[PDB]
Design a protein around this ligand. Structure first.
Ligand SMILES: *[C@@H]1O[C@H](CO)[C@@H](O[C@@H]2O[C@H](CO)[C@@H](O[C@@H]3O[C@H](CO[C@H]4O[C@H](CO[C@H]5O[C@H](CO)[C@@H](O)[C@H](O)[C@@H]5O)[C@@H](O)[C@H](O[C@H]5O[C@H](CO)[C@@H](O)[C@H](O)[C@@H]5O[C@H]5O[C@H](CO)[C@@H](O)[C@H](O)[C@@H]5O)[C@@H]4O)[C@@H](O)[C@H](O[C@H]4O[C@H](CO)[C@@H](O)[C@H](O)[C@@H]4O[C@H]4O[C@H](CO)[C@@H](O)[C@H](O)[C@@H]4O)[C@@H]3O)[C@H](O)[C@H]2NC(C)=O)[C@H](O)[C@H]1NC(C)=O
Ligand SMILES: O=C(/C=C/c1ccc(OC(F)(F)F)cc1)N1CC[C@@H]2CN(C(=O)N3CCc4[nH]ncc4C3)C[C@@H]2CC1
Ligand SMILES: [Ca+2]
Ligand SMILES: [Zn+2]
Ligand SMILES: [Zn+2]
Length: 803
C-alpha cells in the first residue's frame, strides 16, 4: 500500500529514502510503483528539450522547462549542459586539447575529489577501438586518462552478477547473486528479472560501495535509475546534486545506461544498427563533461567509465536441446541460455539421479556445443560453486550457442542476434575500463585486470576502508597517481624444520623397493652440499613460499629440486625447480621403473608407503619433481624418494606425465628457461580455500594418505626472454593451472587419442592466477624478489588466457 496523496514539491530525487506507506520521489520510485501523484509534472519536466539554442540565452526563468538558459541558471545549478557553449561562447570539453591534471583543481568547500561511475551495459571491449570514430568524448577520456585494453568480468557474464560484483569486490558465489535468475532451496523462493522478490534484502550479500561510504561518513548519490527516466535527466540530476551545499552534497555518484546491451541483443555485437547506440552514449558523456566544466569540476572529479560484460553473436538456430540427449526430460528443471543449470523438478521424486544425467550429457554428439560438470569440477578460476543457489549440475556452453530444454521453449516462449553469459575468459565477453581525473595517471595504458579489483580502488579514490572482499588490495596501485594503499607482506606463521640424516634404511617397512644399491672423496662431499642446500639459489628463485597457517613441515634440499614436505599431509605442499633452455629430457631407465626410495631425513611414521598403493586398485602414484628432467644419472635417484611421491589416479597420470615429459621442456625452450613450483590442493568443500586435516573426504585405501582434489603448477620466467629465468633483472612473467584430480578423463572428449591432441587443451581450460593457488594452499609466493610489492601483487592476479 502507498498513500500517493503526498507531494514531490521541493523533493525531486531526494537522497534519504522515506519508508512506506508515504510516497517517494527518488530515482527508483517508478520501479516500486510508489511515486507521488505529481512526480512526473515536477521531477520529470521535458518542455523545450535538453539543449539551449541561441534564442533562449538570457531568457526569463520558466520553471516548466527541462533545463534552463536564463542568467540565474548557474547559481541554481540547473542550466542545460551546453549553456556556456551557446550563450557564453565557451567550447565543448571534447574540443579542448587535453592537459595533464597534476593537482586536483577543486572549488572552495570540496573536501575530496568526487567520484562518478559511468556504467554502460554490454559495452564490449573492442568497441573502444572499432567505434572510436563515432565516440570522440569516450575516446578523449580513454587516451588522456588511464585505460585497460579490456576488463575481465566475472562468471556468469550476466548483468546482475557483474554489476553487484563491481559494487562489492566479491565473486557472485559470495555476494549471492549467482545469476539474473535464481532459486533458493532454503528460502524456497525464486529471484527473477521481472517481479517483486528481487527487492527483498535477503538475496543481496556483502557490502556494496554506497553502504561502505555511508557507514564511514561519505555521502552517496543513489546509484540506480528507473528505466523510464531519460539519460539526459540522469545527467542533470547528478549535476544538481553536485550543486548542493557542502554538508548535503554526496561525494560518490553513478550513472547507468541500458545501452548498448539492449540493441546488442537485437542486432549482434557489430550489427550496422550498433553505430547509433554508440553515438548516443558518447553524447551523454559529452553532456556530463560539459556539465562538469560549467561547474568548474572538470579537473576535479574522478570519472570511471566501466562496462559489465561484452556481447556475442547468437541466434535461434544455434541451440542444443536436452530432449535430444535425455529420456527423462520432464523430470528436470533447466535454467537455460548461455549457461545451463539443472536440478530435479520435484523434491518428491527418488528416481532422479545426477550421475546418470551427467552421463547422458557426456560427449554424446560429435560436434557438441556444451559440456556438463558437477559444480565442484568447474575450472576453479570461475569460482562458481560455493553457494546453495548454484545447482549441482552445470552446463558450460560454447560461445555463440544456447542450451534449452525442448524445442518448444524457443518458438513458443528469430527475435535476437546477440547474447552474453559465457565463460569469462571468452574474448567477446570482455568489457571496458577508463579512469580519468586528478587521482588517475595521465596517458597511461595498464594491463587487463578483473572487475573484482575495482571496489578496492573506488574505496581508495574516496578515502574509505573497503569491506573484506576478493580483490587484492594494492594490485591496481599502478592505475593511480597518488592515494596509493601501501600493502605489506603477510607474516609467516609456521617456520620449517631442516632435517639432516636421522634414520637407517632398515627402520623403514614401506613395502617399496629400488635397485639403487649399485655404487669417492671429491664427488661425495659434493652431493652432501646438495642435501644442505648448495644449489637452492638455482631452484628456489623467489624465496621459499611462506606457510600462512599452523602446521609442521620440513624443507628438503636436492641437486635438482627443493620442497616443503608436510608431516601432516604426508607429501610436499610445494616443490620448486628450475629448467634452463639447454636442459635435456631423459627417460626413466628400465631398472628404475618401480623404484621408490625411503628418505633418511624423514621418519617412517611421516612417510607414504607403497603397499597402500599396491592394495588400492583405483589409486596409483606420481612424482612432483619429474624424473624425466634429472640433471644427471646420479641425480635421478633423488626424484624417486618417497617424499617426492603423490597419489594420482591412472587417468590423471596420463595428463601429468605428458605435462612433465613434454610441456615443461617446451616452455623452457619458448621462455628461455622456466622455474616451476608444483603441489597438491585439498578443497573437498569447494570454497576456494585450503581444507584443514579434519575436512579430507578421501584417503588412499587403508592409510592416512589424503587424496588431492587438484594439482597446481606455477611457471615463472623473465618478461624479457632474452634473459634466462635464473638471471632475470626486471619484471617476471607467469602462467599457472589448477588441474582437477579426476579418476577419468570424461572432461576431454578426444582423450582416447594421443596426449598431444587433448592434454594442453585441458590445461588451458584450467589456467589459474597465483592468487587462486594461494587461497587454496595457504602459501604466499614471491617473498624475495627485486620487484616492488605492488608489482608482485599484480603478477599474482595475472591470468594467462590463451585467447
Ligand atoms: C572472497 O571474499 C569473501 C569475503 O572476504 C570471503 O568470504 C568470507 O569467508 C569467511 C570464511 O569462509 C566467512 O567467515 C565466516 O563468517 C560466518 C558468519 O558470517 C556472517 O556475517 C558476515 C558479516 O556481515 C557483516 O560484515 C560487516 C564487517 O565487514 C559488519 O560490520 C556488518 O554488520 C555485516 O553484517 C556476512 O557477510 C555473512 O554473509 C554470508 O552468508 C549469507 C547467507 O546466510 C549471505 O547473505 C552472504 O552473501 C554470505 O554468504 C556467503 O558466505 C557464506 C559463509 O559464511 C556461505 O554460506 C555462502 O555460500 C556464501 O558464499 C554471514 O551472514 C561465521 O559463522 C563463520 O564461522 C564458522 O566457521 C568457523 C570455521 O573456522 C568456525 O570456527 C565457527 O565455529 C563457525 O562454525 C559454526 O557453523 C558451522 C556451520 O553451521 C558449524 O559446522 C559449526 O559447528 C559452528 O556452529 C566464519 O567465520 C565470511 O562469512 C565470508 N564473507 C562473505 C561476505 O562471504 C571468501 O572466502 C573469499 N573467497 C575466496 C575464494 O577467497
Ligand atoms: O541503474 C541501475 C544501476 C546502476 C549502477 C551503477 C554502477 C554500479 O556499479 C558500481 F558499483 F561500480 F558503482 C552498479 C549499478 N540499474 C541496474 C539494473 C536494474 C537494477 N534494478 C532493480 O530493480 N533492483 C536492483 C537493485 C535494488 N536496490 N533496491 C531495489 C532493487 C532491485 C532495475 C534496474 C535499474 C538500472
Ligand atoms: Ca576448502
Ligand atoms: Zn548487462
Ligand atoms: Zn544483456
Amino acid at each position: 500500500w502507498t498513500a500517493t496523496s503526498g507531494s514531490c514539491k521541493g523533493r525531486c530525487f531526494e537522497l534519504q529514502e522515506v519508508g512506506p506507506p508515504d510516497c517517494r520521489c527518488d530515482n527508483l520510485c517508478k520501479s516500486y510503483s510508489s511515486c507521488c501523484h505529481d512526480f512526473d509534472e515536477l521531477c520529470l519536466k521535458t518542455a523545450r528539450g535538453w539543449e539551449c539554442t541561441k534564442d533562449r540565452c538570457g531568457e526569463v526563468r520558466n520553471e516548466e522547462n527541462a533545463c534552463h538558459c536564463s542568467e540565474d541558471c548557474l547559481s541554481r545549478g540547473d542550466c542545460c549542459t551546453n549553456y556556456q557553449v551557446v550563450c557564453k561562447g565557451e567550447s565543448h570539453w571534447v574540443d579542448d586539447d587535453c592537459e595533464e591534471i597534476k593537482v586536483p583543481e577543486c572549488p572552495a568547500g570540496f573536501v575530496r575529489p568526487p567520484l562518478i561511475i559511468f556504467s554502460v551495459d554490454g559495452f564490449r571491449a573492442s568497441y573502444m577501438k572499432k567505434g572510436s570514430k563515432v565516440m570522440p568524448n569516450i575516446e578523449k577520456l580513454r587516451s588522456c586518462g588511464t585505460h585497460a585494453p579490456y576488463m575481465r568480468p566475472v562468471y556468469p557474464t550476466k548483468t546482475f552478477p557483474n554489476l553487484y560484483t563491481l559494487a562489492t569486490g566479491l565473486y557472485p558465489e559470495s555476494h549471492g547473486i549467482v545469476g539474473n535468475s535464481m532459486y533458493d532451496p532454503v528460502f524456497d523462493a525464486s529471484f527473477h528479472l521481472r517481479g517483486r522478490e528481487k527487492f527483498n534484502h535477503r538475496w543481496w550479500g556483502g557490502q556494496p560501495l554506497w553502504i561502505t561510504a555511508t557507514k564511514q561518513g561519505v555521502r552517496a548519490g543513489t546509484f540506480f535509475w528507473s528505466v523510464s527516466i531519460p539519460h539526459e535527466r540522469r545527467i542533470l540530476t547528478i549535476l544538481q546534486w553536485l550543486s548542493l551545499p557542502d554538508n548535503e552534497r554526496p561525494s560518490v555518484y553513478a550513472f547507468y545506461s541500458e545501452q548498448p546491451d539492449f540493441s546488442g541483443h537485437k542486432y549482434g555485437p557489430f550489427g550496422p544498427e550498433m553505430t547509433n547506440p554508440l553515438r548516443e552514449i558518447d553524447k551523454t558523456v559529452g553532456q556530463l563533461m560539459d556539465g562538469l566544466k560549467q561547474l568548474r569540476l572538470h579537473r576535479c572529479v574522478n570519472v570511471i567509465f566501466v562496462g559489465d560484460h561484452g556481447m556475442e553473436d547468437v541466434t535461434c538456430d544455434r541451440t542444443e536441446f536436452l530432449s535430444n540427449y535425455l529420456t527423462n526430460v520432464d523430470d528436470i528443471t533447466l535454467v537455460p541460455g548461455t549457461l545451463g543449470r539443472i536440478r530435479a523438478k520435484s523434491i518428491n521424486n527418488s528416481k532422479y539421479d545426477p550421475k546418470t544425467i551427467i552421463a547422458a550429457l557426456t560427449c554424446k554428439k560429435p560436434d557438441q556445443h556444451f559440456k556438463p560438470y558437477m559444480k565442484q569440477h568447474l575450472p576453479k578460476r570461475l569460482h562458481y560453486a560455493n553457494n546453495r543457489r548454484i545447482e549441482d549440475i552445470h552446463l558450460l556452453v560454447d560461445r555463440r550457442w544456447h542450451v534449452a530444454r525442448k524445442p518448444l521453449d524457443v518458438y513458443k516462449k528469430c527475435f535476437f542476434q546477440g547474447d552474453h553469459g559465457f565463460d569469462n575468459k571468452v574474448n567477446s565477453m570482455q568489457t571496458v575500463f577508463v579512469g580519468y581525473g586528478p587521482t588517475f595517471k595521465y596517458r597511461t595504458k595498464v594491463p587487463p585486470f578483473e572487475n573484482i579489483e575495482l571496489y578496492n580502488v573506488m574505496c581508495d579514490l574516496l578515502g574509505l576502508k573497503p569491506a573484506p572482499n576478493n580483490g587484492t588490495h594494492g594490485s591496481l596501485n599502478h592505475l593511480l597517481r597518488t592515494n596509493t594503499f601501501r600493502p605489506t607482506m603477510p607474516d609467516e606463521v609456521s617456520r620449517p624444520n631442516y632435517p639432516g640424516i636421522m634414520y637407517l634404511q632398515s627402520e623403514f617397512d614401506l613395502g617399496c623397493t629400488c635397485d639403487d644399491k649399485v655404487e669417492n672423496k671429491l664427488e661425495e662431499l659434493n652431493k652432501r652440499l646438495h642435501t644442505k642446500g648448495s644449489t637452492k639459489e638455482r631452484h628456489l628463485l623467489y624465496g621459499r613460499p611462506a606457510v600462512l597457517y599452523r602446521t609442521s613441515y620440513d624443507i628438503l634440499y636436492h641437486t635438482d629440486f627443493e620442497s616443503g614436505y608436510s608431516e601432516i599431509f604426508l607429501m610436499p605442499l610445494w616443490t620448486s625447480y628450475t629448467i634452463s633452455k639447454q636442459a635435456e629430457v631423459s627417460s626413466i631407465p628400465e631398472h628404475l621403473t618401480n623404484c621408490v626410495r625411503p628418505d633418511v631425513r624423514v621418519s617412517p611414521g611421516f612417510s607414504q608407503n607403497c603397499l597402500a598403493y599396491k592394495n588400492d586398485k583405483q589409486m596409483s602414484y606420481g612424482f612432483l619433481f619429474p624424473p624425466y628432467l634429472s640433471s644427471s644419472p646420479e641425480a635421478k635417484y633423488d626424484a624417486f624418494l618417497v617424499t617426492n611421491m603423490v597419489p594420482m589416479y591412472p587417468a590423471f597420470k596420463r595428463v601429468w606425465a605428458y605435462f612433465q615429459r613434454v610441456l615443461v621442456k617446451k616452455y623452457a625452450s619458448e621462455r628461455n628457461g622456466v622455474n616451476v613450483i608444483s603441489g597438491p590442493i585439498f578443497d573437498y568443500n569447494y570454497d576456494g580455500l585450503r581444507d584443514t586435516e579434519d575436512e579430507i573426504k578421501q584417503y588412499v585405501e587403508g592409510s592416512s594418505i589424503p587424496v588431492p582434489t587438484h594439482y597446481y603448477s606455477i611457471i615463472t620466467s623473465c618478461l624479457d626472454f632474452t634473459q634466462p629465468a635464473d638471471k632475470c633483472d626486471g619484471p617476471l612473467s607467469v602462467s599457472s593451472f589448477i588441474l582437477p584430480h579426476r579418476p577419468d578423463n570424461d572432461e576431454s572428449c578426444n582423450s582416447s587419442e594421443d596426449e598431444s591432441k587433448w592434454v594442453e587443451e585441458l590445461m588451458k581450460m584450467h589456467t589459474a592466477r597465483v592468487r587462486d593457488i594461494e587461497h587454496l594452499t595457504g602459501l604466499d609466493f614471491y617473498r624475495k624478489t627485486s620487484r616492488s610489492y605492488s608489482e608482485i601483487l599484480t603478477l599474482k592476479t595475472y591470468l594467462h588466457t590463451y585467447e
